[PDB]
DNA sequence: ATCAATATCCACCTGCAGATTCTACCAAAAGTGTATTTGGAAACTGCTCCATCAAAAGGCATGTTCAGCTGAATTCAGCTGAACATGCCTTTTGATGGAGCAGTTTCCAAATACACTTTTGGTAGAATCTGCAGGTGGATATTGAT
DNA sequence: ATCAATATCCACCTGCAGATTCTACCAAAAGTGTATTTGGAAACTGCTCCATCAAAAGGCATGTTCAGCTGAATTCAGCTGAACATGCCTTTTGATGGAGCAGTTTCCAAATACACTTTTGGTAGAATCTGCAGGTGGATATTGAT
């Protein structure tokens, strides 16, 4: 009988079978339900979609066709929520957001 | 003809814009490697290092120092100053949880 | 006057916000978040929540006050509290 | 209803914080800060309640909510 | 006689091609992405593990995943994540 | 079998520390923040490297890997992206 | 018959610590010495806090330890304080501390 | 109903470090919290240690490294001493 | 500083109400003894990467000079926040039940685990592909002093 | 109002280091069937919890003087930024091996499995006692006038 992957069954790019294995191997619970790896793989794929969206934008405002860490930093930090979610996270080679305190400008 | 000379703070602000625009590491690589190895050596002798281990440490250290400099400057501006001073770093680290 | 007040309240450990206002606010906030349900509250849940909130406010007041004194003042200003909240991240 | 957090109560809190003098606008700022705190914690705690299929917020719900926001409370069962 | 390193790279690239078909990604940026996927994975799975433990349940189900997602993501992000996870689950069971 | 490493926190030069403060948006710099920065950087590296070396020792290795450092950073609340693959 | 706590010279429960390691989803297997070691560490930290806390309770000439004494003991010790730096003790209050500039 | 707790052992330890001193029921609640907390930090770290190294067993070695990573120095020294001491005592008689 | 006069602070006390300990009972948990399995340590080894040296080019750290402007100290006014007394409304404290509802307890269809076998999807190395880094040089600021 | 003097922006260009695609092998997901487990579905209870509803205790809301502080204005010494020349040490690229990370394979000290028996810890009421609600009263601050 012909094989269909659970990723296809769920309509997802991220690998459901791999996520399931990683849940088993991680000692999170004695047992793992069928729907947990689908849900988890979907959530990860969505957040990935959301970061690649904004960072691709940043890459096009910088007239670049390839996303570099700087674009990830711009996307995360300029988005209030991606910034709260990765607020204790450092992006290697990402730099910081342009910000000069006004008091420092000439007057 | 008088030699041209910018006013104190023009070049500083120029550098703020420049480095806030960029993302390269700001400490030299080899001095940083010697620092890392010396500290490690004091914990356990004859350690080796993947080059990416040193790279990771530099990325984290530089991100940490830039961020502490941010908070330090906020503290300096709070006391109606434009110059950051050691008391500013100590206060920022204190509020952050690192000290006292 | 103010010194006695500081020494006295720092020597104590009782909750400093009155219970009924606090619980009224806690339940109101709960109902707002939950889209309007009818959720019950253990007494110990409200007391835990108030212990946490009061300790949070007291410590934010310590930090904010260090910023106050950093500025050469002894009057705590709102911008002292918000700068402390910013530096805590 | 947030005004039930009175001026003398907030003064008490800041006195325990070692504050000598208090600007008159610190009561509004304190009420707003307390409002954001309670919003965050209560959101998480009620979420723990709903997942357990309970309609009563227990102390443990609040303790979990506090622990996962890095604000560990001792003395209520965890 | 050869190591075999798994990674999220092909799937990050698939998603990338869907949101931005003209765009590529430097290997460092991809490393940032893989870091991110592994990070959120362990945050969600960890929180779900605590949820099952708190409720004396030994199975981690999509329900514990859902509550972990609500607890971990800031709102809106959490809503849209819930939409896509629920949709993937209901599609999967048929 | 290599020349002793001494006093290398002085290799963290005055211009590099200034550059870091510029990326932090600092316009003016007191003459004593270079030493203060060197001390803060030293405590930071001591803490992270201490933990990472502990992960090295526990894996019975003589080589600090990037993962050792990533773990050290994560457990000190300073998650780094881009060094696990 | 004697318990594993007795064999290891401990008041803290080795059998219980071991069961909690098994049931906590920490690893597939748990070695014989792991719960002994862990129970010992726990009893040590408890001994240290009860030590300082009794000290603090008697410096206020009280015969019974209450949260206030735990708070004083933990906060006046640099190491107990750094270990419990993100922890709130209910009914413990804060350390007496007035900034000098105010005096 | 059946709630387990560390109260018996905190009371035993208290009686041996200060036989004269007692403990409030709330202070006992604080102690029980402290024990549960440190247990979950050390066991959590031990689990991450065994997993990073592709190990399925948590041994006293993973407990030792976890204690080293988690306790501030000195506190860690005495903890390592007491755990090692307790194990070697347990393994003989 | 000295008193002088006041206003709370802080040890110190009772006696007794309510918190803690003491005493038994017992399901649930720990321990025991016996049998069986297996994760991982050790002893190999192959082959990544790591260390350390070298030299060359030149980029950048260093130490100088020197003056602009910043921080620190000062002085003074006006306005804000503290210290008051008072009575009134909100909060506390106490049942009364009623009821909601959290926990338990038993059972069973639906679910999950797991060994075996069949199949791809995912990887590593290799073969292509091509974005953009670094190199110009000219426009367009921006700055600072005449 | 304007220029000289600097810097920054910005567009264009190429080839090569770094990203994308291609290709086979194989490890790991999927399919299958059977064994094991579970978390609700439904039907029990006692406990906190809330709605009143209530009666009051006591803490706060209120409005005036005033005393001390926050902020503005000002002044000057000296510190730090800017712009130099100088030369050294970082960067780059490659060598020269060697160490040690990582892959296999074998096999026991250490782990799990399981049927029992022995202890233990939790619990609830009784029997003990510790703290604290309050009441001092003299020390220890504070404030004011010599």
Author numbering:
A (entry chain C): 12 to 118
B (entry chain E): 36 to 135
C (entry chain A): 46 to 134
D (entry chain B): 25 to 102
E (entry chain D): 30 to 123
F (entry chain F): 18 to 102
G (entry chain G): 14 to 116
H (entry chain H): 32 to 124
From the paper:
The histone octamer, containing two each of histones H2A, H2B, H3, and H4, left-handedly wraps about 150 base pairs of DNA around itself in the nucleosome. CENP-A specifically localizes to centromeres and epigenetically specifies the sites for kinetochore assembly. Similarly, in human cells, CENP-A overexpression can lead to its ectopic localization to chromosome regions with active histone turnover, as shown in cancer cell lines. At these ectopic loci, CENP-A forms heterotypic nucleosomes, containing one each of the histone H3 variants, CENP-A and histone H3.3, within a single nucleosome24.
In the present study, we report the crystal structure of the human CENP-A/H3.3 nucleosome at 2.67 Å resolution. The CENP-A/H3.3 nucleosome forms a “hybrid structure”, in which the physical characteristics of CENP-A and H3.3 are independently conserved within the same nucleosome. In the crystal structure, the CENP-A and H3.3 molecules were clearly distinguishable. For example, the side chain moiety of the CENP-A-specific His104 residue, corresponding to the H3.3 Gly102 residue, was clearly observed in the CENP-A molecule in the heterotypic nucleosome. On the other hand, the H3.3-specific Gln68 residue, corresponding to the CENP-A Ser68 residue, was distinctly visible in the H3.3 molecule. In the homotypic CENP-A nucleosome, the CENP-A αN helices were shorter than the canonical H3.1 αN helices in H3.1 homotypic nucleosomes. This CENP-A-specific αN structure is perfectly conserved in the CENP-A/H3.3 nucleosome, in which the CENP-A αN helix is one helical turn shorter than the H3.3 αN helix. The structural asymmetry of the CENP-A and H3.3 molecules induces the asymmetric wrapping of the DNA in the CENP-A/H3.3 nucleosome. The different electron densities observed at the two ends suggested that the DNA end on the CENP-A side is more flexible than that on the H3.3 side in the CENP-A/H3.3 nucleosome. The CENP-A/H3.3 nucleosome generated a biphasic histone dissociation curve, and the first and second Tm values (70–72°C and 82–84°C) were very similar to those of the H3.3 nucleosome. As anticipated, only one CENP-C bound to the CENP-A/H3.3 nucleosome (lanes 3–9), while two CENP-C peptides bound to the homotypic CENP-A nucleosome (lanes 10–16), and no CENP-C binding was detected with the homotypic H3.3 nucleosome (lanes 1 and 2).
